[PDB]
């Protein structure tokens, strides 16, 4: 199967920098939809980052454009979502998605902005 173990969570000061990784196996990272979703505590699913195969297209959301960027690594078969200019409302759990039609919702990483 396809495993999307993800790590990078922790305690980071507001406005800090973090590079969380979503390790992949069993398929190249340039073939399917490496999407991203997050659950703020008490909030519903939200769309933040998304890429398509071969990396010629990439789209963001209203609260994501111009502030966060998504990267890929074909050699490591990993997709990276760096985090800069955090706000107190950004605390969430980021979900890694294999495909738009993938039942493999990731286990998620807890990101805290603190003060």
């Amino acid at each position: 199967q396809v495993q999307l173990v993800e790590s990078g969570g922790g305690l980071v000061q507001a406005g800090g920098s973090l590079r969380l990784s979503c390790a992949a196996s069993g398929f190249p990272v340039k073939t399917e939809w490496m999407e991203w979703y997050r659950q703020a505590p008490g909030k519903e699913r939200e769309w933040v980052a998304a890429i398509w195969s071969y990396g010629s297209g990439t789209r963001y959301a209203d609260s994501v454009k111009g502030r966060f960027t998504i990267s890929r690594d074909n050699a490591k078969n990993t997709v990276y979502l760096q985090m800069n200019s955090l706000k107190p409302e950004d605390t969430a759990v980021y979900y890694c998605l294999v495909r738009v039609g993938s039942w493999y919702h990731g286990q998620g990483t807890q990101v805290t902005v603190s003060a």
Binding site: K43, E44, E46, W47, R59, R99, V100, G101, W103, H105
Partner: protein, 497 residues
């Protein structure tokens, strides 16, 4: 020394002929409207999976949690999240632009996406059948009984398709509608040609073209007036009921009566026509003895080699022309501009294109005009299909240029095929060319079915077919010298020259 002498003797410019030819061609507006109606009656509005009622939207705070988004910024059109699972609680549509269509009533969407095109292909199968068999049935029965039957059948089928319990009823009634509509389209023109004298031949054809274009206008007018599909189909099909009601007032063509072996009916019809035309005195001299003394095949098509090649090339020409024309006409949901405006613009460009090709063929030639119409149409369709969806006004201008080119190619191919075949088999050639065009309209929706493999591939095929048709159209020679070939041997002798 023929029926034509009696026709001038009876009339030719009288009130009866003009009133009958403006009264039998009026339903061609709805003929064109019914042919194209799938644009407005089966438009696809934006849609997405409906979240199950188990989840509460009050605590969700939005519908993004239960709907994946595509690259365009809209919710997914076939899929739903699990907290992924396919649409199993149906779909949700909007009513901002299209209040209702067939793809809204019977959710003809992903995993049923092909069924609307299948219904269209079944309607065109009905067209082909109701031409092929009803031509023989009209030759064996008449040209007025067949016309009234066509009016009744098209009206009944239109209403019954407007009220369809499910999709299968819709497809079957569309097949019957195609039957009747092809029969009326191919019978009204021949009845008008038979009744009217030689002077207004192809003048009736110009009138038919004008009526078709006016019907293209009228379709957009009704669509703007009535957007609901169950009401749009009813409004477009109701006047066919009054058409069947008042079409008992037609008068059978005297040529068919004479060809049936009886001249008493021909004499009665001619005296009636003289009576309504007001010149009873001149028609009084008519009698049975006067009529008698004055009124005096695919096998060989597929046997003769030169005839085989001529038929094959003309068949490909009709195939490509109808194929591309219908593929372009019945695909205007994704052209940016509103449906009604682009429809009336297509109807508008219909006329100047026909004027231009007529001027060119009467000045330059027929084969070059057909070539420059078909190749330009194919190029326009290709460059329309390769341009990204973001552009709207340039795409619409390209589409209207393409339709102008298709109409010019239609006129050119009809004229050339009329003045190309030998008089022995010319009528059979024209009929088989029309059959080829009808099966082309059959196959065009089947090609458009394959949008699932690639969204723009139907346009690619619709534009690639005419290009290869024009490329392989090589044996057909120019006919500007007006030789009017009579027999196969004369065709061979003039072929070398």
């Amino acid at each position: 020394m023929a029926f034509n002498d009696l026709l001038k003797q009876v009339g030719g410019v009288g009130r009866f002929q003009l009133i009958q030819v403006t009264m039998v061609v009026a339903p061609l507006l709805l003929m064109a409207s019914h042919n194209t109606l799938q644009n407005f009656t089966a438009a696809i509005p934006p849609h997405h999976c409906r979240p199950p009622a188990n989840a509460n939207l009050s605590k969700d705070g939005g519908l993004e949690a239960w709907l994946p988004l595509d690259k365009q910024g809209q919710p997914e059109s076939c899929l739903r999240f699990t907290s992924t699972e396919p649409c199993i609680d149906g779909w949700v549509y909007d009513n901002s632009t299209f209040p209702s269509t067939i793809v809204t009533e019977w959710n003809l969407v992903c995993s049923h996406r092909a069924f609307r095109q299948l219904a269209q292909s079944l309607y065109m199968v009905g067209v082909l059948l109701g031409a092929m068999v009803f031509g023989y049935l009209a030759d064996r029965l008449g040209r007025r009984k067949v016309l009234i039957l066509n009016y009744l059948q098209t009206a009944v089928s239109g209403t019954c398709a407007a009220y369809a319990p499910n999709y299968t009823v819709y497809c079957v009634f569309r097949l019957l509608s195609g039957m009747s509509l092809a029969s009326i389209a191919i019978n009204c023109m021949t009845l008008n040609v038979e009744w009217m004298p030689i002077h207004t031949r192809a003048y009736v054809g110009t009138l038919i073209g004008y009526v078709y274009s006016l019907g293209q206008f009228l379709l957009a007018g009704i669509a703007y007036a009535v957007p609901h599909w169950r009401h749009l189909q009813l409004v477009v099909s109701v006047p066919f009921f009054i058409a069947f009601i008042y079409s008992w007032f037609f008068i059978e063509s005297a040529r068919w009566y004479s060809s049936s072996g009886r001249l008493d009916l021909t004499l009665r019809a001619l005296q009636r026509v003289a009576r309504i035309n007001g010149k009873q005195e001149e028609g009084a001299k008519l009698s049975i003895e006067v009529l008698r003394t004055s009124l005096q095949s695919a096998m060989e098509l597929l046997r003769c080699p030169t005839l085989r090649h001529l038929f094959l090339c003309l068949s490909m020409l009709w195939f490509a022309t109808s194929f591309a024309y219908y593929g372009l006409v019945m695909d205007l949901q994704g052209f940016g501009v509103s449906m009604y405006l682009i429809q009336v613009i297509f109807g508008a460009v219909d006329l100047p294109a026909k004027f231009v090709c007529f001027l060119v063929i009467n000045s330059m030639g027929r084969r070059p005009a057909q070539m420059a119409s078909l190749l330009l149409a194919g190029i326009c369709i290709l460059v329309n299909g390769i341009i990204p969806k973001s552009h709207t006004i340039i795409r619409t201008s390209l589409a209207v240029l393409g339709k102008g080119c298709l109409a010019s190619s239609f006129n050119c191919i009809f004229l050339y095929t009329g003045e190309l075949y030998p008089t022995v088999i010319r009528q059979t050639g024209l009929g088989m060319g029309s059959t080829m065009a009808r099966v082309g309209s059959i196959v065009s929706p089947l090609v458009s079915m394959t949008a699932e493999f690639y969204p723009s591939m139907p346009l690619f095929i619709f534009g690639a077919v005419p290009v290869v048709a024009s490329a392989v159209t090589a044996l057909l020679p120019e006919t500007l010298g007006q030789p009017l070939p009579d027999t196969v041997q004369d065709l061979k002798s003039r072929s070398r020259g």
